[PDB]
Write a protein that binds this DNA or RNA. Structure first.
Ligand SMILES: [Zn+2]
Lengths: 44, 53, 96, 117
RNA sequence: ACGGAAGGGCACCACCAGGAGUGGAGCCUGCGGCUUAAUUUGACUCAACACGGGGAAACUCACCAGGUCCAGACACAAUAAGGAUUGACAGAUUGAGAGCUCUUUCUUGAUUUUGUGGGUGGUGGUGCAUGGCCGUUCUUAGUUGGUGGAGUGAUUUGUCUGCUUAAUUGCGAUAACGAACGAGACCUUAACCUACUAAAUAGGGUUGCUGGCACUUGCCGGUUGACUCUUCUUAGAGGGACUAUCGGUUUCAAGCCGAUGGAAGUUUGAGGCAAUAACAGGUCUGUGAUGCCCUUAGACGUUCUGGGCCGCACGCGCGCUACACUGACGGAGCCAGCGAGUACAACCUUGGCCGAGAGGUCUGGGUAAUCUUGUGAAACUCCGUCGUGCUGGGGAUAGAGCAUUGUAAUUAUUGCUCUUCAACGAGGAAUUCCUAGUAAGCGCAAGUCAUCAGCUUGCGUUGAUUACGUCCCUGCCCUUUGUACACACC
């Protein structure tokens, strides 16, 4: 188990599927959501 | 929370249960009672069963 | 205990109107009867109540019973914010 | 409905058997011999014979008023169909269940073993 | 309390007169031993061993092999949003679309996570810390107290020479008189009632409408068309039995034995309830019945997934099917009683089609003297085929496929179809159960049950031989005797 690597103030574009609700996660050409488990592939 | 946390328990001995505690052995299911044979002797005359002969 | 606090206030809600809760002993159930929360969520909520004053309860025939004391009515008025002349089950609604 | 007559007659006995068991727990402090159910049309008269009658009722409808709501959620009933009364016992000497509660107190308090008998 | 000491009694859990057989064979299933990573634990003479309602495919499940989960209630306290911590597809990962995490930077907004207490959970330890309930001493005849007597006293007679009884059951004899509990009485069930009280959910008659038939009036019917009733049938409410009436036989007492009446004459048959006093008999593996010891998150609590409780040179215990001609293999004939049974589930399931079977399917009816159901079940009856040869008797081991119940049948679940066709020519010492609708053939139903009787508890068909007595054997009750025993001859 893990402490979650907690770090506030972090630190981008809103969701296509949902409204103004969740922000995307930036990687080396890789994306996934927070609330709607994890449902992205292409860059946005 | 976790996905797999059950088995098809709609039949057999594991799914069936008594009303008092929950013993999976010596279960009376005749007339839809569901009270095990140890506690049935205790609660016989209250339900209405008697030892006539 | 790990209960998002939207669900926990709905247990205090439903207790306050009727004044009685008859919870089954069955853990790992989809949702509770009448109230729209889990059975493990409901039992652990009323389990935490018993430690800090209240609540009159049993462990008989796979049926947990819960009926609030006089001080227990005062505790629930603080969180839910209802002042006086309310539901519970100390006095009747009218003719009953 | 529509259920057979043999099944409902046995189910009637277990319904009472549950009710008698819970009132042994709930009315342990206030005295309790038993329960007598009489299912009339619509309503149902549940007569609880006990020693301390006014304490079983409570403060003008509190103990019994809460207990009537409990029986509804257990066995699925509406407000009006059940009425929990409280009547006195026909003597303590013959009714041998009353002596067990007095003896249970005397051992829990700390009284003599032989001289209680 | 014992006695390898003596009188008098009693029991097919003893024995005589006999019947059926188990111990022999093959196989089903419990217990050992062996076996094993695990082959889960209880139980040890009658009173362990088809017992735990124990027929485990996963659940069950206390056990291994390898993993997940917090379900750490709460008292107070360390970060207390410059996050307490909750979730997380994608492929390395992983039995594995378990975020199990190690690759990841989005979520989530005080529910908690992190110390010390504090628990809750346990088919964890102890039946020799206990309670309830069951077993056994024993369903045997035995056990107590009130006045009066005998004893300084522990105590004792009453509770007994006899004769009866199934029985301290009763007659009679008397420092004994009356009394209670146990048994007997009581309660439940099976018989008898053409007399009451009754019913198209019970069956019969009058008759109609009608179907066919022998051709005279009469035979078989098909309808819940009509009218009416109570023999069977169910079940209220009563009677019937009291050893009755005689004959013998007894201090010619209490009873017992031979007739006659009677549906009934062993307490009229069988069970149900069951005294004081005990055992260190069984159960902590029915339990939010439970003392305290252990176990208290890297979990003996848990939860999912494969595997085992069924391994096989070998012993004993109940059991099933056979060792055939009183029989097996064919048709034909064809009769019971106890039960049981879904509507929020998937129950019993006729009638019609498909199929050599098992079983597929369309439909019902039934919440049940209404439909399954007349549960036309077996053994039996009667003509044919084989006839005394391990044979056509017997069915075990075997292989292939066709069905069904299941998430799953390979460690054949279960049934079916042809083939494979053995062991055993009435069983050695020993040994169990049994006095009449019983014994022993015979199947049926229920109980457990998603699917599985070679088991147990209940029912009705077929229905004997042989006592109708006794302490010789094996043990039980009293009296009289002896004791250096009193956790009492282990
Ligand atoms: Zn999204």
């Amino acid at each position: 188990k893990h402490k979650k690597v907690k770090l506030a103030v972090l630190n981008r574009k809103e969701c296509p599927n949902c409204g103004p609700g969740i922000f995307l996660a930036n990687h080396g050409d890789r994306f996934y959501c927070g609330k709607c488990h994890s449902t992205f592939a292409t860059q946005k | 929370e976790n996905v797999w946390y059950s088995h098809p328990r709609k039949f057999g001995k594991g799914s069936r249960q008594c009303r008092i505690s929950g013993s999976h052995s010596g279960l009376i299911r005749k007339y839809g009672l569901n009270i095990d044979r140890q506690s049935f002797r205790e609660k016989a005359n209250d339900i209405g069963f008697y030892k006539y002969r | 205990m790990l209960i998002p606090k939207e669900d926990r206030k709905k247990i205090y809600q439903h207790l306050f109107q009727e004044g009685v809760l008859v919870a089954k002993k069955d853990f790992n159930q989809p949702k509770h009867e009448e109230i729209d929360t889990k059975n493990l969520f409901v039992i652990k909520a009323l389990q935490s109540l018993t430690s800090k004053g209240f609540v009159k309860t049993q462990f008989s025939w796979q049926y947990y019973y819960y009926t609030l004391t006089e001080e227990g009515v005062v505790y629930l008025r603080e969180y839910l914010n209802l002042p006086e002349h309310i539901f519970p089950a100390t006095y009747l609604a009218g003719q009953s | 409905a529509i259920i057979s007559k043999k099944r409902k007659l046995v189910a009637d006995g277990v319904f009472y058997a549950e009710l008698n068991e819970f009132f042994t727990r709930e009315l342990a402090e206030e005295g309790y011999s038993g329960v007598e159910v009489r299912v009339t049309p619509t309503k149902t008269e549940i007569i609880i014979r006990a020693t301390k009658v006014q304490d079983v009722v409570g403060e003008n409808g509190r103990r019994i008023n809460e207990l009537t709501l409990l029986i509804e959620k257990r066995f699925k009933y509406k407000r009006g169909t059940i009425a929990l009364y409280a009547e006195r016992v026909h003597d303590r000497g013959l009714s041998a269940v009353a002596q067990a509660e007095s003896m249970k107190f005397k051992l829990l308090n700390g009284l003599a073993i032989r001289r209680a008998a």
